[model samples]
Target: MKCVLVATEGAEVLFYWTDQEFEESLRLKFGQLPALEDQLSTLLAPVIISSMTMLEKLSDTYTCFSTENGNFLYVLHLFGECLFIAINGDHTESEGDLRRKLYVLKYLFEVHFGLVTVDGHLIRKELRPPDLAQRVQLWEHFQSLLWTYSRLREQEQCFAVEALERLIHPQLCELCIEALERHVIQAVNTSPERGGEEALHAFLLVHSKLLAFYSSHSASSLRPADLLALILLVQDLYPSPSGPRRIFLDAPLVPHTMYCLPLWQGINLVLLTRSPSAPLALVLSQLMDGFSMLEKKLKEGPEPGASLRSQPLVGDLRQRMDKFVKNRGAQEIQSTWLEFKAKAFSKSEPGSSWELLQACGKLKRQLCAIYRLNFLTTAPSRGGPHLPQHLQDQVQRLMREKLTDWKDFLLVKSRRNITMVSYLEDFPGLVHFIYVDRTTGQMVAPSLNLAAFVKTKVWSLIQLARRYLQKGYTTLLFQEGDFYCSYFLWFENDMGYKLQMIEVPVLVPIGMLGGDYYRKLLRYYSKNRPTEAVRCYELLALHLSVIPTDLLVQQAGQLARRLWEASR
Candidate 1:
């Protein structure tokens, strides 16, 4: 249902990732071209070349193309000497979603190739090997990472908002924090096997929300976006109630290693380390013991005369902790008896009070050690530094025959792909229009020139429309200079029945970068309707100022209906 491609500005295809359906469609259209050895690149040459031609001749970039069938959306992005392209089959993905994927792809490329990315020629050679087998290996690696990333983004809560949510309980939070800093982290830092790696940030999570977080003075503050991405990474490697996992994160400039240890009762300890060599398994082994003991205490009510009861700690600490740490275990019962004897008979100034708290600290460290040993030394070993040879061969072999015969047709389609000329006869006054399926985050629009004057006009019209749309206005008609414009936002169900219009709150900012307003709007609307059944759309049109506003609205509505019909 998805594909990504990297091509040169000069029309050479360096790499491509396509699902079976797309490849089959290509084969059926083009026929077999066994005579041509490099058929895939040849088939795609026309589109890549045509896009570059438009960039140079019309001073406009080719961003996307759609066909009459409307089964897929093709989006293209130009970066340096490379052209990145993505195609989506299902309507679930939006333009913003695809763009984000491309950005992540670029980041991954940089991480995998590093300084070699700066050299276009070198990268091209690396991605497009002359040997078919080599090419398959390159693509398989990329495909695996892409699927992993997509799964994380779709299912994780922290990833959806790109922010961390914290559990709301004061006493439990304080105790966990104190234990992590005073006992858990201390044990790891002092371990000789840790090498030079030190724990930078340590935190506990209850489900997806944070319970406690502690960071060393030398550790840089983690950005919300990076932290959320880290959460996604952790979830991908180890789902809840799963075993420990080791991951590397490089988004926030300062790359770090992460050890994710999932404990019992939905609690997890995440440790971020600056040293890649840090004994992750060793550390987690120690922390697991601490968490297990804490879990037991959490199940039992607090001891009758626990030390935490009398300290004037913040907000109902005694009552909350008492409720949190419920019935005593056999070992806890035995410890309680010893503490009682020491406090009743001992005459020392420190007395049994100090000894009891000391025992508590030691017990906390033991639990920490349990988690540390479970994962700290079991990190996965690095595989071959290069892409596997067999995977590369498999991909190139799959693509070789399908692309052999369609070289010219693809080029032709690239230039005149679903032009506005076809829609002009149906909607006479339509000069330029853009139809967005907010539910899918895809748009259908004509490719326009990049002239400054035209760009200004388009920008102005969009801003004007946005102003009205923000205030609960679903439809608008206005004239700006020489052009008359009309805008409409509507909703429908899967059966194509138009749904009732309701006021949408202006939540996220109005662009793909800051946030996707339409996505938030869709979520808001789905609260009342079945999410899978609801679909939202927006249509904007421009015409001669002389055109009547009523006629403009009518034309816009017709175009919307026509396109929707075509999609099916």
Candidate 2:
């Protein structure tokens, strides 16, 4: 039931990722072992072929089918020329969830493989690599991404509503934005280090929460799918800041190098770039971020050993240290490095922390000087980007010193985030709520711990509300079982003036991976509504079934009004 499958109209199983049971089920129920794609196509392809065959004959679709005991459910999606077939072998996943699963797979495909997916031939051509080993690696990589997205959506509220979470860090948030703009964005684009590569988007993440986000004017609107999945790739790719950097081939031709340098514990500095040529300026950009991260960490933290000790001199710093070792190819430098490490570790406790941080400081200056000397005055060697590392160090150090008092606070804040307890007082009977901005794909919801039974019922409520909302009814309040749920969508202009509700297309069910129903709604409504920009907001409120309907409405209204006010 948890598994997903992607294939073409031709019935070729381009890819599939299931749990061990899915594989074993195929083994016992069907088979494998030849070409994986070729073999799975045989077992699953009957339904796939049947769907595609019917579509060709009718020029439309026959999308769903269910079995007697409701043990099996099938849904088909036509993504480009690829026909995505989703099979849910249990009642655990409703028909709506399975359909959205296919839709989200398209979003992920767009995120990873980019716009090229529209042309079916190339995706099948390349996704099925000529080399079998590389082919499996590619297929499995796609599978791993799906499973990770699956896992995150199951718990994280932000992922659930497809909203990017922003940390509420009062004044400290501004500091990150101000400094990040100057060094990471301005310098990367306008400075000598640009090397013809432009950084379209630069943002900071406190754990997975957005601290500050910036986009160059020419950058396309980063869909929530892009930003949400951006966080996933950053966390998934190098969960730890290992030496080697990753380049994501986001578009068909342009390769996007997202240099994610962990600025400190729980904070990540992310820069996304795409080049017409080489892997952008990720090298120089990461170098800038590296020293910048170190400078800040050194300046922040609880004075002495606590700071750098937890940081572990990882990421770009580790890369720098490795380069430092190998740059001086002589055997003496390697031996000297080994001896330095040995001496630092062997030294007494008090001496150790001091020596380590001091030595790290020493390396920082040299690395900056080395980069500055080589790239800053060197005219960028025919358009390869390079930053003056010294400049980054000073700016980053100042930002750190500026936030020194707040560093400890921000560290703890990321862990706790916004909780349901604060809102509990005002709406005591309110069991849960989801508030979202369709325009921005950002959601605000307090963490809710759902029991298994509660979870199922809540989800069922969500789907029912979504299905009704799709029919264009702007207001919905229904009480069932122990839960009284309310779903509301309102259109507002920049002035906070509410607009009349328009027809919402009666189509796919809305869920985490659902085909951006709200997004499409906004887009459609925009074309018909006033020329002035408009925003669509959704509120999902759940309260105890015993709560008076009138009181529930009042709670929902107040919740809606205050949440919007607070966001400002």
Candidate 3:
């Protein structure tokens, strides 16, 4: 599972790992030599023989981790025949000693044997680090490209349009393009000379390559893991945009990991690197205000500008995010005045750009409070809502607007101190429930409605758990249409043991409430028949049990079924 080898000649030393036990023994014997000359030559014979056998049965790549203290230590994780290697060198050793030994050993195996592909090009394997000359030439090529693009943009020549289009047009890899742009934006903002000609050129190269990839691939062909890596690489290059982009509420797709995770990580990176204590607050505020205009467009749309919405907000946010970026420990408020203007001016009115700007302002306030509470204060009377303060405000605001029914239910439930309740509505009913739940914390509501035939008690059980199960809660009672299901979810922190239990009722409604097939079980209440009350509980129970998790998965499965049904 893991291996480490260290070789020494006088004071000089080398470290490595291979799957074979005998190769390590040979290296240990080789370390006893006084002369460092041909040290790897003596060890290579056994290492090569042993490594070949290991590689032959390779089912998966091996993994390794190595760090040098007095001698080099390596960790190799072998899974499915593949190996992972992680290495760290001890600085105490002479530079040449480490370099020479590593070069020969790495070359004999990783390079000549074709074990490592650093850039993923699978071109000529690198034996040693590139000479300064190679790096200089690479730098010069980028400088040339940047100078050309800058000149074109500055002159507003016909070529400028083409150059800009090349950078901005359909990206090959959407995630990668966005990341590189973010990096470029950050580089430009931090460096007085805007990352100079060389840095700008590097950004453009990555952007162009990503766009090329996108055009060649179909949606079905996209690999999530690859996308994640590419996006991460892009984040390293571009970073996160500093300001807000408009929120698309009814936008068809949710923020998948490929898009949201990298962006979030990138933003946090920018914040932590620049303002460790209060980075998110500043950036969030800037973004919220910056993209307030876009949010307005989406919410109140009569064909809002598609081009504006499509444009990656990273660049736009970056331009306005200057207020937040500062050298570490620089405590002077960069631009409280600018923040004030943004917050005061931003409004979600029709045709107003200020909305985006305002949203950015608010987001920064929120982020700052969330991350760096010391730097921020609670909402002040003089200023508009603080960014951090608004999360609660927003949540409460939504609840007031949409959870009126739940509020009323809670009012009644509080009288008896009932633990929980569930509500189910179809189509418009589902909308009400979703709105209510989104606005209010209580009342488990179905986000999606199933067709009458698809209704099942098993599905309902899953729904109740999702809404009520917070992180620390051990067990929760899930009420669904005419049935109460109890789900147990717990993990013991010290013992590292997890426990889960579920109880589903034997009988349940077969169809939507008010339908002929809908069952009513609890009509009698002592002397009087509380028919309406029983129906309410039954419907609530039904609604609670209709879990969204499996239903959504089933929905995906049903897509093909619908096609078949249509064909018939």
Candidate 4:
């Protein structure tokens, strides 16, 4: 049903994850392209760039796409540096979903590995981590986000609105906010045992919906895209029967470590710490980074002698290097040390920082061997990173101390955030309804939990609305088989005063998930008026065809009026 591939420019895969059937099929296609130590580049990159060229010329017509029967859909986007392809050979997702996923992969670039978002080849290297432990975790994390977002997008309203959905517990959620700030995030960040590591964001998830989210004063806001990204991340890491499970996500600066604990069956507490690497490896790695920076300064800096003498890091490195060579005490390193004096360090040295750069690289590689022999064993180590058992236990114990009694209520509430009471009383013919308050970006929709409902019809209905609505229209009444549906959006000012249904400037018919066109519509209106004063409400519903249109609007009017008017 799914295949995701991200490939770099020439015959090289940054990475790819696909199902078995797709793999055998792709291997059949790409094996025709010469498989060697050479990448799928000759195969995949050609297909990617052909579409890249077609996008410029034939542009409007997408891949020989389809609906019904066995729909083999391949969505492609070349962000220049990387060409990401999404294939759904089976009918799991529509073309829009595949296209949105291509953008999701890009936004993730803007989040985790953001340093490279400015450009290209760096992206290829960033995607391929040299460290084995890091490589495995990064690839594994991407797979989880891909699979989880795919499965949940159609079902969760959080994905539908592309905003974080919150569990509404008036008194308890207020307490949820304060406790996460004081007890967990503040406690972990201030605690001395963690050394330099700091917790950035701490959040409580009531199943898939966010209850309380707290970020440190130092850290800027987490993107809504990233917030929902983490929700599926936690969902992927659920069923940690014991304590907080350690997870790693890369930060703009250093690498980050995450710990997730199930406070209750349905409520989970997740904490993030920016911890880079382990002890012996962590120490040796420093001199390597230090001298490398020094050599870089010499290369970039104007005068070689000024660059060498003006720096503060070398003062520290000389003392450390003097200390380093003695402990190792190897004759080869001693002979290599002799070159350090001959090239640059000695008083008799003629200028040319070029030799200084050479010795620094030689020593950097020499230390790499020392680090490899001691720390870089093939076997994974038990004592890993700058995290400790004591630190995790302390945070876990504090969370349990605060939330001990309300455990049962949270578990119950998580399952029933907005229960499926649709089959009951008033709205008889309603198939499914989703109501979104674009102003606050929160949704309250009834559960789409029904057996006989055609999954594809409902899923495609959403994509259809997104497709048509972006072009300057809303208020749709369409019939798919026996089920009739209504989709509409309304606007209001400060006191629920009805405003005009503004026409959106029809941009591209093909959408971008970047800031979504609907979001742009709200922002477009807000620029002329007070942003808070203008409120946008969207409500959609489906029904049995037996219901007449006169009363169908009646059914929808009562539901939208009563459902979200008070709360939102």
Q: How does each model score on lDDT?
A: 0.58, 0.64, 0.30, 0.66
TM-score of 3: 0.19
lDDT of 3 by residue, 489-551 (tens): 221112323322223223211211101111221211211432222211111222233446445
Candidate 2's C-alpha runs over 4 A off are: 29-38, 186-194, 217-221, 238-255, 276-408, 449-458, 508-515, 526-533
Better of 2 and 3 by lDDT: 2
Q: Find the candidate with the highest lDDT and give its number.
A: 4
lDDT of 4 by residue, 370-471 (tens): 543443231123344554677767777788878888888877676666655644476776767777776656677654444645555666567777777766
Clashing pairs in 2: none
TM-score attained by model 1: 0.44
Clashes of each: 46, 0, 64, 2
Pick the winner on lDDT between candidates 1 and 2: 2
Worst 10 residues of 2 by lDDT: 244-253
- lDDT for model 4 comes to 0.66
- lDDT for each residue of candidate 1 in 1-568, tens digit (9 for 90 to 100): 6667787877666667677777776677678444221555677678887887787888898888876666778888887889988888877676656777787777666544433454466567767778787577757756766776777555442343233444444565676667677654665676555555677788765545555778887766654435555554555455542222244333213225555554433445676665453344333333334334433443363542443333353124323323323432336534643563454234553233445545555445433333333322334232212212343233234323333453354344433435778877877767777666655444566555434555456645665676677777788877768877677777888898868988776522354322346666777778877645778777767788877776766777777778888775
Model 2 Cα shift for residue 194 (angstroms): 5.0
Q: How many backbone clashes does candidate 3 have?
A: 64
